[PDB]
Amino acid sequence: EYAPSPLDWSREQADTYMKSGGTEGTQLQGKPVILLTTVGAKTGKLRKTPLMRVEHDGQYAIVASLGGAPKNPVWYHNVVKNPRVELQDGTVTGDYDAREVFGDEKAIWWQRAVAVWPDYASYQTKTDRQIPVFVLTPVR
Amino acid sequence: EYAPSPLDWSREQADTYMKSGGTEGTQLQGKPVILLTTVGAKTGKLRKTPLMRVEHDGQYAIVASLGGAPKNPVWYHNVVKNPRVELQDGTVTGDYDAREVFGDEKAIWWQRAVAVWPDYASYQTKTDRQIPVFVLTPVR
Ligand SMILES: C[C@H](OP(=O)(O)OC[C@@H](O)[C@@H](O)[C@@H](O)Cn1c2nc(=O)[nH]c(=O)c-2cc2ccc(O)cc21)C(=O)N[C@@H](CCC(=O)N[C@@H](CCC(=O)N[C@@H](CCC(=O)O)C(=O)O)C(=O)O)C(=O)O
Numbered sequence: 074e075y076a077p078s079p080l081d082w083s084r085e086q087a088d089t090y091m092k093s094g095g096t097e098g099t100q101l102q103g104k105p106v107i108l109l110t111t112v113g114a115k116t117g118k119l120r121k122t123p124l125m126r127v128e129h130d131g132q133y134a135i136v137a138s139l140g141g142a143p144k145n146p147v148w149y150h151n152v153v154k155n156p157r158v159e160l161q162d163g164t165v166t167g168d169y170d171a172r173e174v175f176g177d178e179k180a181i182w183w184q185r186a187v188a189v190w191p192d193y194a195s196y197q198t199k200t201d202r203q204i205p206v207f208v209l210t211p212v213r
Numbered sequence: 214e215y216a217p218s219p220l221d222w223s224r225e226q227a228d229t230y231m232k233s234g235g236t237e238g239t240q241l242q243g244k245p246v247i248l249l250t251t252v253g254a255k256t257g258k259l260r261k262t263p264l265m266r267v268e269h270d271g272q273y274a275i276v277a278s279l280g281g282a283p284k285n286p287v288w289y290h291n292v293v294k295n296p297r298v299e300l301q302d303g304t305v306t307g308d309y310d311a312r313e314v315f316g317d318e319k320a321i322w323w324q325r326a327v328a329v330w331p332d333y334a335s336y337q338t339k340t341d342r343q344i345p346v347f348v349l350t351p352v353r
């Protein structure tokens with residue numbers, strides 16, 4: 074009662090990430106965090122979203138978890154509509170194309186994500202909604 | 214003169230800016246440079262555009278001119294359609310609302326811009342078309 078909401082923390086972390094040029098706000102419980110920029114599905118405004126860092130050979134994966142909620146985070150719809158995103162990993166920023174993965178291809182990235190953030194597994198057991206995963210490829 | 218083509222240079226400067234987290238690529242002939250993020254008017258894709266830094270009390274101005282050429286840079290149309298932009302000044306990134314300015318209000322910012330980059334004045338004498346200027350106001 075009177076404490077900030079999980080959404081307030083997320084906003085604050087994003088802000089710190091931006092103000093600091095990727096030097097602060099890059100961690101959550103000692104695990105690395107990236108900053109995603111998406112284009113609003115409806116408004117066309119830039120939205121900043123801290124997410125866990127899941128990386129393999131220059132590609133990143135992002136997970137639309139929101140704890141184990143019934144409904145996807147709003148940013149999920151931004152990525153689907155506008156797959157050109159920006160991902161900042163510490164001081165390094167790049168543009169990427171995002172592609173939702175399914176089945177066996179997803180299970181690969183899902184395992185890599187759980188290795189970074191074990192709670193993802195627990196999130197999935199809390200809900201029948203299949204937690205989306207996108208794979209991000211640098212533009213070349 | 215062994216200069217790179219203006220497109221290639223722009224891409225490269227933007228890239229350096231992004232890779233370095235605003236620590237490199239922030240200068241052009243000893244004058245400061247910002248990195249503008251816009252949403253494509255038609256595609257909805259993120260575009261990164263290095264521009265001269267023109268600043269006053271937390272607001273920025275940006276000037277739309279490739280030399281004194283007949284047609285506006287294409288990013289001009291992105292800002293008109295999608296006035297919510299991002300501006301990176303060195304390590305600092307923020308969200309801004311952009312509005313095109315005219316008459317007396319423009320002349321104020323035009324003076325500040327010429328102080329930073331005198332060539333702007335010369336660009337305007339090469340064309341009857343009035344070189345656009347936007348004023349960017351922080352939001353959030
Ligand atoms: C070719 C095009 O680039 P541009 O026209 O944005 O280039 C303008 C240049 O000014 C920039 O490269 C700029 O970075 C250069 N520059 C500077 N330029 C300055 O002006 N001022 C400065 O102070 C400055 C400083 C500066 C300092 C260092 C440096 O390295 C460069 C600097 C492009 O990327 N094309 C791409 C993307 C274009 C795009 O955004 N496309 C939109 C299309 C929206 C549109 O145009 N809508 C209508 C237009 C119709 C109409 O106009 O009525 C349509 O296409 O139907 C989208 O994605 O949606 C492509 O073809 O794919």
Ligand SMILES: C[C@H](OP(=O)(O)OC[C@@H](O)[C@@H](O)[C@@H](O)Cn1c2nc(=O)[nH]c(=O)c-2cc2ccc(O)cc21)C(=O)N[C@@H](CCC(=O)N[C@@H](CCC(=O)O)C(=O)O)C(=O)O
Binds near residue numbers: 080082115122151
């Ligand atoms: C409430 C909403 O948030 P959301 O995008 O649904 O999801 C909440 C997010 O904070 C949340 O998903 C993540 O940021 C939280 N989060 C992680 N969330 C995850 O899902 N996965 C992670 O791995 C993760 C890691 C993480 C690490 C650190 C941290 O601080 C937060 C982390 C929001 O930001 N609303 C904004 C923007 C909404 C938006 O994009 N609007 C759209 C359309 C909206 C409409 O249709 O009404 C538009 O502009 O077009 C607003 O209402 O103005």
